[PDB]
Q: What sequence folds into this?
């Protein structure tokens, strides 16, 4: 429909911890925007099943965060593996953005990309090698004019779709607040 090699793929993952070699992906969500950050379509929001032995690696932060959000219950009830989650997400993305064109977009998105390289390389390969990291702009704004940052706030629920929507909203805020293009 609005298929374009200028469209942006936004992605957020939730994990059982910070180490891709030890931990697992338990949620993924994607959004496609056009190049002007208008949201065109939201992709599959997938709680990925993991056995208790993997959930049992979670520290207190992860356990309390992902239990209180309802994600742990959704993970336990899920019948979707990483491979099926890749299949669903690729089938969505192919309708909106060509392979290899969009940088990976999000907040500190290098961390998600590490988990994609390790656990979902077929999905990682769909992105261009570059990164659109909204937190790059956050950090530059904090140093150049930190008063700007008091004008925007995040809920930070660690529900993957809500958090990637907040990533887009943050960049929209920066477009008006710190950019002149
Ligand atoms: Na994130």
A:
């Amino acid at each position: 429909m609005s298929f374009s090699d200028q469209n942006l793929i936004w992605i957020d993952l939730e994990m059982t911890g910070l180490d891709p070699e030890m931990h697992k992906i338990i949620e993924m969500a994607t959004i496609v925007t056009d190049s002007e950050l208008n949201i065109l379509a939201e992709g599959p929001v997938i709680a990925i099943h993991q056995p208790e032995s993997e959930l049992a690696k979670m520290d207190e932060w992860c356990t309390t965060t992902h239990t209180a959000s309802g994600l742990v219950a959704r993970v336990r009830q899920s019948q979707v593996s990483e491979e099926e989650a890749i299949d669903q997400t690729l089938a969505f993305l192919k309708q909106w953005v060509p392979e290899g064109k969009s940088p990976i977009c999000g907040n500190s998105i290098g961390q998600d990309r590490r988990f994609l390289y390790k656990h979902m390389p077929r999905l990682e390969a769909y992105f261009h090698y570059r990164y659109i990291d909204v937190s790059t702009i956050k950090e530059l704004t904090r140093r150049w004019q930190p008063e700007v940052l008091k004008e925007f706030s995040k809920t930070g629920s660690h529900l993957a779709l809500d958090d990637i929507r907040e990533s887009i909203a943050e960049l929209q805020f920066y477009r008006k607040a710190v950019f002149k293009i």
User: Anything to note?
Assistant: The domain at 1-181 is CATH 3.30.420.10 (Nucleotidyltransferase; domain 5). The CA atoms of residues 7 and 34 lie 4 Å apart.
